[PDB]
Ligand binder design. Structure first.
Ligand code: 4R2
Length: 375
């Protein structure tokens, strides 16, 4: 039996970021089912940072994370966590009212957002089919995230603060015993006053083991693939390209191109595989919008983006289940919100107010709380 101050289930970006901030204040033990910590959604993302994306709460958490990403503590990482990658959202269907709505809402949050005409969009990504382009928004502040450096920075930080990150430690039974949570794994048992449920698509499964009413979390499959660009064109500086209805996205990645149909097909929590239909649809949509020819993709995969009803993230104690803390519903935003989520969740776990720099971005405890959800 191992005793901790904070017992975290899940070592993805959610558990790693929360554990990182908690580890300055007490003993953190993170239990991870897989042999490695980033095998599920945290290892499967498009690795992009976009402020004007998601609900208002998501946008606030994303904006509030930028300070840490651009200036992490000494020793956190060897190289920058972000690299410049503007986002261009292109209207391919002739919907000027929607284009203007997105421009105005994005510009209110990102003053440098621009409205482009068709020629300006085609200048930036020359493979766009000019006949299909009706304008675009352009966000000069988008960035690519070095997700492995970020994730490993969080995990190493836990260990440097005398915490533990224990892989091959699936939580199998969870019980509140004598004022603390006790978790049984095949490889040992663990006890702590606080159980941090950071289990990704499995958060409601963890609540089920504990007898705690679940959130209603819905995992949703998104597939993606990498393909070769034509050898005679330099796409390495292209922005992240998205269609106005998020029917697809396309971004450069290590001399290749990363594409996706940006799907959200509801599925159960599992080790999700790409569906051939997902890949075919993404290929079709990119070829409809651009002059690219996509041969058989070099690599395809899928991951889970998990949401509650309102599309917002969840960080808070469960009502009437003392010490059970949700860090859940990261949706399509878990990487880009992770610094603010980790800092906010650690403060709330410790029953402290949210730090000033988070409240100034317009975050409060209530809009993170799970109590907002079910009747
Ligand atoms: C698939 C995917 C996902 C994303 C994306 C793409 C694709 C293709 N991107 C986008 O399309 C962006 C579109 C932009 N579009 C417009 N601009 N217009 C994206 C992104 N996000 C982000 O910011 N930027 C991105 O660019 N996403 C989302 C992030 O992928 C996601 O939100 C976080 O990764 C979630 O992280 P979590 O930490 O919640 O989840 P987890 O990594 O699965 O970890 C849980 C751990 O619990 C363990 N576990 C379970 N049960 C137990 C147990 N019993 N015992 C012990 N351990 C247990 C489990 O084994 C696992 O290890």
């Amino acid at each position: 039996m191992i005793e901790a101050d904070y017992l975290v289930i899940g070592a993805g970006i959610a558990g790693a970021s929360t554990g990182y901030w908690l580890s300055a204040h007490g003993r953190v033990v993170v239990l991870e089912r897989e042999a490695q910590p980033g095998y599920h959604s945290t290892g499967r993302s498009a690795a992009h940072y976009t402020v004007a994306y998601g609900t208002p709460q998501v946008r606030a958490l994303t904006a509030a994370s930028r300070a840490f990403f651009d200036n992490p503590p000494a020793g956190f990482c060897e190289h920058p966590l972000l690299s410049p990658r503007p986002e261009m959202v292109v209207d391919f269907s002739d919907d000027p009212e929607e284009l203007r709505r997105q421009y105005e809402s994005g510009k209110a949050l990102v003053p440098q957002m621009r409205l482009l005409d068709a020629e300006q969009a085609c200048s930036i990504v020359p493979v766009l089919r000019r006949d299909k382009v009706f304008g675009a928004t352009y966000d000069p502040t988008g960035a690519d995230i070095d997700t492995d450096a970020l994730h490993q920075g969080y995990l190493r930080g836990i260990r440097r603060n005398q915490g533990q990150v224990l892989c091959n430690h699936e939580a199998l039974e969870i019980r509140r015993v004598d004022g603390a949570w006790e978790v049984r794994c095949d490889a040992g048992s663990y006890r702590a006053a606080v159980l941090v449920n950071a289990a990704g698509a499995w958060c409601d499964a963890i609540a089920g083991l504990a007898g705690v009413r679940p959130l209603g979390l819905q995992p949703k499959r998104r597939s993606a693939f990498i393909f070769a660009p034509p050898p005679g064109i330099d796409c390495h500086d292209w922005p992240m390209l998205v269609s106005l209805d998020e029917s697809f996205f396309l971004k450069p990645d290590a001399g290749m191109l990363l594409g996706s149909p940006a799907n959200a097909d509801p599925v159960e929590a599992h080790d999700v595989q790409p569906e051939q239909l997902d890949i075919a649809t993404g290929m079709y949509l990119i070829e409809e919008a651009t002059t690219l020819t996509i041969r058989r993709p070099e690599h395809t995969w899928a991951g889970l983006r998990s949401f509650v009803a309102d599309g917002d993230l969840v960080a808070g104690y469960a009502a009437n289940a003392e010490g059970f803390f949700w860090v859940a519903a990261q949706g399509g935003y878990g990487i880009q919100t992770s610094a603010a989520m980790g800092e906010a969740s650690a403060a709330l776990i410790r029953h402290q107010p949210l730090p000033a720099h988070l409240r100034e971005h317009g975050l409060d405890e209530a809009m993170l709380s799970p109590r907002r959800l079910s009747p």
